[PDB]
């Protein structure tokens, strides 16, 4: 998935 | 809608290369990956920019820093700033840009494979891009759910609260009592399953076209600073031509440039104008723009 929305 | 070039340098020759690739591969499709840059000309206010009425209202409301407006913990402790931003940014308050209509043209020409967008303005959909071709990676206001039990709510319940003066009594779930919010992905949350799922399918589609025509991935108006969305570019097949239309070179195009990478420093709307010209679709485009 790629993980949580972040910088 | 009127645009001009970013500098005295011309980008028509570079844009011509793109049109040439599409001319040599008439049955190929394009995948776009876009960000906030494509909606700037629509007049959408940047919540992180002082000098924007939105920024100062959020500051007056004690928001600690811009992005706290999209933070789950903060929202639950004080939903007013988010509600205030929603009132100003709710879909229907703006109109699509020339670039958004370009996406529509491509769809009309059957050369649009998919458009991955980080924006929550839903101007691609508002412009007529089909639901099947759009991937709103960060959600939108079109759906609402309780943050505690996940119960589904029609988007209109939330929207009606935004027209009240002052905004108070926020939407609470009639099952568990927690706050109900629009299906916008906040920092710290996972993106919707359709994001990874569709990219999984489009990644295979890309790799398989390399061996038959040739596809094209065009990245526009994004700083590629938010993950996981920003991982897409590096995941494009080495043998698939990557194009970047952005005022500045960013992300993988800067960190790991590729021989075949085509970089175009231009405003997304000017880029749209030039591409339509080099493709010879000015007639259909004008029709859409005047429609
Ligand atoms: N008209 C136009 N054409 C091409 N590129 C443009 C334009 N206007 C801005 N830009 C470029 O688009 C990029 C926009 O970056 P940004 O504002 O950070 O937005 P994103 O799409 O990448 O990210 C969203 C952010 N919004 C909420 C979250 O706070 C994110 O950090 C940036 O690199 C600019 O050089
Ligand atoms: N596009 C946006 O409004 C936005 C807001 C916060 C974080 N990332 C994107
Ligand atoms: Zn609930």
């Amino acid at each position: 998935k790629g993980g949580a929305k972040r910088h | 809608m009127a645009s001009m070039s970013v500098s005295t340098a011309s980008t028509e020759m570079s844009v011509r290369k793109i049109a040439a690739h599409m001319k040599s591969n008439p049955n190929a499709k394009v995948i776009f990956m876009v960000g906030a840059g494509i909606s700037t000309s629509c007049g959408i206010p940047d919540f992180r920019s002082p000098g924007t009425g939105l920024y100062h209202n959020l500051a007056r409301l004690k928001l600690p820093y811009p992005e706290a407006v999209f933070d789950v913990d903060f929202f639950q402790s004080d939903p007013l700033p988010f509600y205030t931003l929603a009132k100003e940014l709710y879909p229907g308050n703006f109109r699509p840009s020339k670039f958004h209509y370009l996406l529509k043209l491509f769809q009309d020409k059957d050369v649009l494979k998919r458009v991955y967008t980080q924006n929550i303005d839903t101007l691609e959909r508002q412009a007529g891009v089909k639901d099947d071709l759009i991937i709103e990676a960060h959600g939108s206001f079109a759906h609402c759910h309780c943050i505690g039990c996940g119960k589904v709510y029609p988007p209109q319940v939330f929207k009606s609260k935004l027209a009240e003066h002052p905004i108070k009594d926020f939407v609470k779930c009639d099952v568990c009592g927690e706050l109900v919010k629009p299906a916008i992905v906040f920092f710290g949350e996972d993106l919707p399953d359709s994001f990874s799922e569709t990219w999984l399918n489009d990644s295979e589609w890309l790799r398989e076209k390399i061996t038959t025509q040739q596809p094209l991935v065009i990245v526009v108006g994004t700083s590629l600073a938010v993950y996981p969305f920003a991982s897409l570019p590096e995941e494009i097949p080495r043998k698939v031509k990557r194009v970047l239309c952005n005022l500045e070179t960013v992300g993988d195009f800067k960190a790991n440039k590729r021989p075949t990478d085509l970089i175009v420093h231009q405003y997304s709307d000017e880029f749209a104008e030039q591409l339509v010209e080099e493709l010879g679709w000015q007639e259909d485009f004008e029709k859409i723009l005047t429609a």
Side-chain angles (χ1 to χ4, degrees):
Chain A
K1 204 67 192 68
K5 182 174 167 197
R6 62 192 186 281
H7 287 290
Chain B
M1 195 99 87
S3 66
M4 62 191 149
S5 183
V6 62
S7 73
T8 183
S10 185
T11 53
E12 296 205 66
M13 288 303 96
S14 294
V15 179
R16 180 171 298 185
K17 290 183 175 55
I18 299 168
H21 180 100
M22 292 174 66
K23 273 173 165 53
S24 308
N25 300 276
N27 294 57
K29 291 180 177 183
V30 175
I31 290 177
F32 289 85
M33 296 173 164
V34 300
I38 70 158
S39 289
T40 55
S41 72
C42 304
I44 293 187
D46 187 338
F47 71 116
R48 304 158 305 181
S49 160
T52 222
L54 172 59
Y55 170 100
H56 290 106
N57 283 326
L58 292 170
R60 297 178 203 299
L61 285 173
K62 303 297 181 60
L63 190 70
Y65 55 90
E67 289 181 351
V69 78
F70 295 122
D71 181 89
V72 188
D73 288 352
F74 190 84
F75 178 68
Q76 298 192 75
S77 73
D78 181 0
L80 185 54
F82 179 82
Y83 269 73
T84 297
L85 173 146
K87 180 180 183 63
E88 183 138 4
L89 301 189
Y90 210 84
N93 285 316
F94 310 88
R95 287 304 173 282
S97 74
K98 190 158 49 183
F99 182 85
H100 285 101
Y101 287 116
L102 176 66
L103 297 177
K104 179 73 206 312
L105 174 63
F106 273 47
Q107 180 181 93
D108 286 350
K109 293 296 181 189
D110 183 59
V111 289
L112 184 59
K113 182 61 185 169
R114 204 84 69 193
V115 53
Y116 289 82
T117 181
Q118 304 175 52
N119 303 336
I120 56 170
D121 55 44
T122 57
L123 287 169
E124 297 92 4
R125 194 181 299 276
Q126 187 181 145
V129 173
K130 286 173 161 53
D131 175 74
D132 186 62
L133 308 182
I134 303 167
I135 293 297
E136 290 158 348
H138 295 157
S140 71
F141 290 96
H143 296 88
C144 285
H145 66 282
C146 169
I147 60 178
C149 79
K151 180 185 178 187
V152 174
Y153 276 81
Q156 293 86 178
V157 179
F158 174 73
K159 189 178 188 183
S160 66
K161 273 57 182 178
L162 310 170
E164 291 181 50
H165 305 71
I167 292 180
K168 55 185 291 180
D169 308 353
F170 316 95
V171 187
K172 305 294 211 311
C173 175
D174 61 13
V175 165
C176 81
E178 295 303 313
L179 290 159
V180 166
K181 79 167 184 63
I184 293 172
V185 176
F186 279 26
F187 283 98
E189 295 187 305
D190 282 1
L191 278 51
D193 293 342
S194 64
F195 179 65
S196 291
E197 289 171 356
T198 309
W199 178 231
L200 175 66
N201 295 313
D202 288 350
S203 278
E204 174 171 293
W205 179 84
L206 283 168
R207 293 195 154 300
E208 304 307 339
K209 285 291 176 178
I210 299 174
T211 167
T212 64
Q213 287 63 49
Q214 302 313 301
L216 202 56
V217 180
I218 303 181
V219 183
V220 191
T222 164
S223 65
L224 297 174
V226 184
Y227 290 83
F229 190 91
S231 296
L232 297 195
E234 66 188 61
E235 289 178 8
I236 297 175
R238 185 90 170 188
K239 295 187 177 180
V240 172
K241 193 174 191 53
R242 298 195 304 187
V243 174
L244 172 70
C245 177
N246 207 61
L247 301 187
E248 296 192 358
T249 294
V250 299
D252 197 54
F253 295 84
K254 176 185 184 185
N256 297 288
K257 201 283 186 61
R258 299 177 184 180
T260 53
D261 280 348
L262 177 49
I263 294 181
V264 187
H265 297 315
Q266 191 56 271
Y267 296 119
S268 62
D269 285 337
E270 182 52 35
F271 174 76
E273 192 84 292
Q274 286 176 24
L275 191 60
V276 166
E277 183 65 54
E278 295 302 316
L279 283 170
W281 298 341
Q282 313 96 310
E283 186 186 303
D284 298 63
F285 195 50
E286 180 60 359
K287 185 178 179 183
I288 291 173
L289 293 179
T290 58

